[PDB]
Motif scaffolding. Structure first.
Motif, PDB file in Angstrom:
ATOM      1  N   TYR A 147       3.082   0.095  -8.481  1.00 19.53           N
ATOM      2  CA  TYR A 147       2.869   1.537  -8.515  1.00 19.53           C
ATOM      3  C   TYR A 147       2.053   2.007  -7.317  1.00 19.53           C
ATOM      4  O   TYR A 147       2.354   3.046  -6.721  1.00 19.53           O
ATOM      5  CB  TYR A 147       2.179   1.935  -9.821  1.00 19.53           C
ATOM      6  CG  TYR A 147       1.684   3.363  -9.849  1.00 19.53           C
ATOM      7  CD1 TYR A 147       2.519   4.399 -10.242  1.00 19.53           C
ATOM      8  CD2 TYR A 147       0.380   3.676  -9.489  1.00 19.53           C
ATOM      9  CE1 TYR A 147       2.072   5.704 -10.269  1.00 19.53           C
ATOM     10  CE2 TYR A 147      -0.074   4.978  -9.508  1.00 19.53           C
ATOM     11  CZ  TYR A 147       0.774   5.988  -9.903  1.00 19.53           C
ATOM     12  OH  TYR A 147       0.324   7.286  -9.927  1.00 19.53           O
ATOM     13  N   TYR A 148       1.008   1.257  -6.957  1.00 22.35           N
ATOM     14  CA  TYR A 148       0.150   1.663  -5.848  1.00 22.35           C
ATOM     15  C   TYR A 148       0.914   1.686  -4.531  1.00 22.35           C
ATOM     16  O   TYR A 148       0.732   2.598  -3.716  1.00 22.35           O
ATOM     17  CB  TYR A 148      -1.056   0.730  -5.749  1.00 22.35           C
ATOM     18  CG  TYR A 148      -2.109   0.968  -6.807  1.00 22.35           C
ATOM     19  CD1 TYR A 148      -2.110   2.130  -7.565  1.00 22.35           C
ATOM     20  CD2 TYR A 148      -3.107   0.034  -7.041  1.00 22.35           C
ATOM     21  CE1 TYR A 148      -3.071   2.351  -8.530  1.00 22.35           C
ATOM     22  CE2 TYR A 148      -4.072   0.247  -8.003  1.00 22.35           C
ATOM     23  CZ  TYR A 148      -4.049   1.408  -8.744  1.00 22.35           C
ATOM     24  OH  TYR A 148      -5.010   1.624  -9.704  1.00 22.35           O
ATOM     25  N   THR A 181       3.807   4.645  -4.488  1.00 22.82           N
ATOM     26  CA  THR A 181       3.278   5.997  -4.346  1.00 22.82           C
ATOM     27  C   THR A 181       2.710   6.229  -2.952  1.00 22.82           C
ATOM     28  O   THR A 181       2.803   7.337  -2.415  1.00 22.82           O
ATOM     29  CB  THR A 181       2.216   6.263  -5.410  1.00 22.82           C
ATOM     30  OG1 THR A 181       1.325   5.145  -5.490  1.00 22.82           O
ATOM     31  CG2 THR A 181       2.866   6.483  -6.764  1.00 22.82           C
ATOM     32  N   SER A 182       2.110   5.197  -2.354  1.00 26.66           N
ATOM     33  CA  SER A 182       1.603   5.327  -0.992  1.00 26.66           C
ATOM     34  C   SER A 182       2.739   5.540  -0.001  1.00 26.66           C
ATOM     35  O   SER A 182       2.589   6.284   0.975  1.00 26.66           O
ATOM     36  CB  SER A 182       0.786   4.092  -0.614  1.00 26.66           C
ATOM     37  OG  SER A 182      -0.400   4.008  -1.385  1.00 26.66           O
ATOM     38  N   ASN A 193      -5.565   1.931  -3.201  1.00 32.11           N
ATOM     39  CA  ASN A 193      -4.766   3.105  -3.546  1.00 32.11           C
ATOM     40  C   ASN A 193      -5.419   4.332  -2.920  1.00 32.11           C
ATOM     41  O   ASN A 193      -6.439   4.824  -3.410  1.00 32.11           O
ATOM     42  CB  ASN A 193      -4.634   3.254  -5.057  1.00 32.11           C
ATOM     43  CG  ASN A 193      -3.635   4.320  -5.450  1.00 32.11           C
ATOM     44  OD1 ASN A 193      -2.693   4.604  -4.713  1.00 32.11           O
ATOM     45  ND2 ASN A 193      -3.839   4.922  -6.613  1.00 32.11           N
ATOM     46  N   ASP A 199      -3.719   7.788  -1.598  1.00 32.96           N
ATOM     47  CA  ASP A 199      -2.605   8.680  -1.303  1.00 32.96           C
ATOM     48  C   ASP A 199      -2.998   9.809  -0.361  1.00 32.96           C
ATOM     49  O   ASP A 199      -2.190  10.224   0.476  1.00 32.96           O
ATOM     50  CB  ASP A 199      -2.038   9.261  -2.601  1.00 32.96           C
ATOM     51  CG  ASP A 199      -1.270   8.238  -3.408  1.00 32.96           C
ATOM     52  OD1 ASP A 199      -1.008   7.140  -2.879  1.00 32.96           O
ATOM     53  OD2 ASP A 199      -0.926   8.534  -4.571  1.00 32.96           O
TER      54      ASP A 199
HETATM   55 NA    NA Z   1      -0.449   4.825  -3.739  1.00 37.38          NA
END
Ligand code: NA
Ligand code: TB1
Ligand code: NA
Length: 418
Positions: A88-89, A92-93, A310, A312
């Protein structure tokens, strides 16, 4: 010593903003009366010292941070929960960088600025074919890549080296385990030493930014108030879309009500905006997650990891910042170079670096990989321009970084419950 002491505890980002404002004013005043040669002869060398120190710290950090970072999230030690949160990390990045690139196309930052510091425009290099770009990620000589300035090949070797070390630490042989631990400790010590040097250099940053801005404005009276407003608008609009178009959509897909999520998490976001630090708000983030009902075994692992890898808000900012510099110099980025931005920004987030002021080092990594060296007078001028307003942008970046951590924990907790 009293005057020098008072200079230290003042926040670094606010000091850099002050240096930017006075540098523009001083350059305009001197340039109107002439004195362009005096600024070039005397003021400029101080600015050139700052960029040389900043570029020196890049390569050692790239190798050391990724080796230590890749060992922490190695597959040899990741569980079922760890694998899901890592995926997920990273995903999304990747979309955050792409979203920032798109926003830079709608609002063109630095398009009106034409930078000729020495009297000549920047000369871009030739673009190799796309198939060759992919193959050159693997270095034929890891020592040669470090000696030269290949960022992407250095990242590739550092990641696989860190993963292999973790497998050695699970060996049955006593000698093999001890050798692996000794190598990791030496590399970890190198990374820690680099962060101490970064702290010292960033204290000299207000002086370096003042010299670079004054030299540019004295020679030519470019107007940057309008252009710096557009880059600020592009970043903050992109951050808003990141929350709405990604976090809200994902929560709706997985059944979590977005409205209730915001109400419980409002305390964490406000603390992130005020403190402007991801690690500082970690105790507050833990309390908020407990209130939502997440099991203690889950968020005690995901939240500390998310605060490190993480980010973003930082990833989105790097996409916008790279296009602003390229537009100001008048160059154009090909699709091969745009994909390099996404690949470099995502992979560099794995490296463990929490020292304040590390965002400037990360931006230098992306520029070097694309092909914009920091030693170029045109690149340094544009770099110092967007670095000056870093104080304004920092508040928004931190809030998005914390918000993404809570969204991932809630999604993972729902899957475990099922
Ligand atoms: Na991310
Ligand atoms: N301040 C932000 C945060 O702490 O979440 C963020 O963190 C600093 C940082 C540290 C390492 C790499 C990139 C950026 C930033 O300022 O860019
Ligand atoms: Na975060």
């Amino acid at each position: 010593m009293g005057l020098y002491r008072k200079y230290i505890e003042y926040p670094v980002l606010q000091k850099i903003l002050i240096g930017l404002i006075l540098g523009a004013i001083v350059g305009l005043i001197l340039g109107h009366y002439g004195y362009a040669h005096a600024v070039h002869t005397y003021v400029k060398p101080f600015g050139d010292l700052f960029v040389r120190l900043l570029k020196m710290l890049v390569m050692p950090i790239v190798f050391a941070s990724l080796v230590v970072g890749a060992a922490s999230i190695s597959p040899a030690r990741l569980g079922r929960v760890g694998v899901k949160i890592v995926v997920y990390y990273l995903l999304t990045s990747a979309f955050a960088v792409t979203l920032g690139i798109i926003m830079a196309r709608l609002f063109n930052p630095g398009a009106g600025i034409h930078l000729a510091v020495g009297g000549q425009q920047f000369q871009p290099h030739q673009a190799p074919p796309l198939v060759h770009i992919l193959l050159d990620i693997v270095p034929t000589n890891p020592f040669g890549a470090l000696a030269n300035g290949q960022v992407l090949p250095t990242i590739f070797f550092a990641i696989i080296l860190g993963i292999a070390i973790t497998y050695l630490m699970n060996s049955e042989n006593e000698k093999v385990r001890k050798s692996a631990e000794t190598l990791l400790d030496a590399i970890n010590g190198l990374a820690e030493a680099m962060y101490k040097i970064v702290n010292g250099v960033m204290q000299y940053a207000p002086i370096g930014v003042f010299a670079l801005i004054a030299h540019v404005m004295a020679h030519q009276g470019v107007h940057v108030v309008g252009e710096l407003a557009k880059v600020t608008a592009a970043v903050y609009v992109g951050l808003t879309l990141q929350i709405l178009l990604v976090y809200f959509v994902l929560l709706k897909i997985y059944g979590i009500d977005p409205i209730s999520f915001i109400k419980h998490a409002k305390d964490a976001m406000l603390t992130a905006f005020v403190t402007s630090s991801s690690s500082g708000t970690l105790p507050v983030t833990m309390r908020v997650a407990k209130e939502m009902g997440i099991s203690e075994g889950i968020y005690s692992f995901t939240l500390p990891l998310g605060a490190t890898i993480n980010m973003d808000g930082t990833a989105l900012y790097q996409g916008v910042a790279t296009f602003f510099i390229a537009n100001a110099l008048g160059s154009h980025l090909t699709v091969g170079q745009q994909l390099t931005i996404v690949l470099t920004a995502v992979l560099a987030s794995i490296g463990t670096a929490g020292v304040p002021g590390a965002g400037a080092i990360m931006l230098a990594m992306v520029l070097h990989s694309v092909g914009l060296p920091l030693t170029d007078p045109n690149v340094a001028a544009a770099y110092a321009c967007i670095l000056g307003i870093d104080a304004i942008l920092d508040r928004g970046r931190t809030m998005v970084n914390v918000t993404g951590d809570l969204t991932g924990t809630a999604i993972v907790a729902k899957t475990e419950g099922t």
